[PDB]
Amino acid sequence: SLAEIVKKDDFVLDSEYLVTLLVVVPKLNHNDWIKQYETLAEMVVPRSSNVLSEDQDSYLCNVTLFKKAVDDFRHKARENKFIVRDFQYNEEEMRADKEEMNRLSTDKK
Amino acid sequence: QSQGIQQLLQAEKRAAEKVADARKRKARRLKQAKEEAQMEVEQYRREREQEFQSKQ
Amino acid sequence: LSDADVQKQIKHMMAFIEQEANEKAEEIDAKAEEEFNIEKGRLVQTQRLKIMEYY
């Protein structure tokens, strides 16, 4: 569960016309990621498409696009050899999940 | 980018504000048109009342 | 490419978005013509009929 690892500060708010996506993975593919997260789709917005997490083997990165251009990003992620990692704005869901994991931890005791 | 993104949201919301003004004006102009049709109807029908009175 | 060209693409997005919102406004205008006329007709009809029955 991506949960708190996700950088909440980098997402769009009031997403009635702009939508963000998260389909980026392996490290070996990021030789020009600095240009990729500016140009992956026809109209990608370059900077809020920010790297969310950094493992040794993988980078996790958000991207921003238009309401109807998200499918192009979804396909171009496969063309760039990534896999889906979508987060779908689960902040309150993550908070409730945090409460539940803590409930289980304290229930053991 | 951040300033540009604020500008994008603000363009969307300026269109939204214009749409809200259009909503207010649609309601008010519908009311004005109802009242104007009522002005016409009352004028003609009360003229018919007076014509009936004189005709009788 | 350049930042200016990438912003041309971003402004193409804004053009589509503004076209959508302005098409909602244009739909409001279309209502204010046609559905405006339709309810005008309804109300004029009911008024005139409630007066014609009395006459």
The CA distance from A85 to the nearest CA of chain C, in Å, is 25
If you ran DSSP here, which 8-state letter would residue A51 be given? Answer: E
Tokens of C7: 């912003």
Q: What is the rounded CA–CA span in Å between residue C38 and residue C30?
A: 12
Q: What is the rounded CA–CA span in Å between residue A46 and residue A39?
A: 7
Q: Hey, is the C-beta of B54 within 8 angstroms of any chain A C-beta?
A: no
If you ran DSSP here, which 8-state letter would residue A26 be given? Answer: B
- Calculate the CA C26 to chain-centre distance: 4
**H/E stretch holding C13:** helix C3-30
Q: Which amino acid is at A87?
A: F
Radius of gyration of chain B (CA): 24
Out of C18, C25, C39, the one facing B22 most closely (by C-beta) is: C25
Of the candidates B20, A26, B25, A32, the residue with the CA atom closest to the CA atom of residue C32: B25
The CA distance from B25 to the nearest CA of chain A, in Å, is 24
Sequence length of chain C is 55
Question: Measured between beta carbons, which residues in chain A are less than 8 angstroms from residue C17?
Answer: 17-18, 66-67
Question: Measured between beta carbons, which residues in chain A are less than 8 angstroms from residue B19?
Answer: none
List, in sequence order, every residue forming a beta bridge with A18; answer none if it has no partner.
Answer: A66
Q: Hey, is the C-beta of A72 within 8 angstroms of any chain C C-beta?
A: no
The CA distance from C1 to the nearest CA of chain B, in Å, is 17
Are β-strands A59-61 and A18-21 bridged in parallel, bridged antiparallel, or unpaired?
Answer: unpaired
User: CATH top-level class for A1-88?
Assistant: alpha beta
Q: What is the rounded CA–CA span in Å between residue A55 and residue A47?
A: 20
Residue of B nearest to C42 (CA): B34
What is each CA distance from A89 to A21, A38, A75, A86, B6, in whole angstroms? 10, 22, 21, 9, 20
| Residue entry with tokens 């405006």 | C36
Kindly determine whether residue A43 and residue C12, on different chains, have CB atoms separated by under 8 Å: yes
Kindly determine whether residue B52 and residue C55, on different chains, have CB atoms separated by under 8 Å: yes
Kindly determine whether residue C28 and residue B19, on different chains, have CB atoms separated by under 8 Å: yes
Contact C24, A73 (CB under 8 A): no
What is each CA distance from C3 to A23, B12, B19, in whole angstroms? 24, 22, 32
The CA distance from B18 to the nearest CA of chain A, in Å, is 17
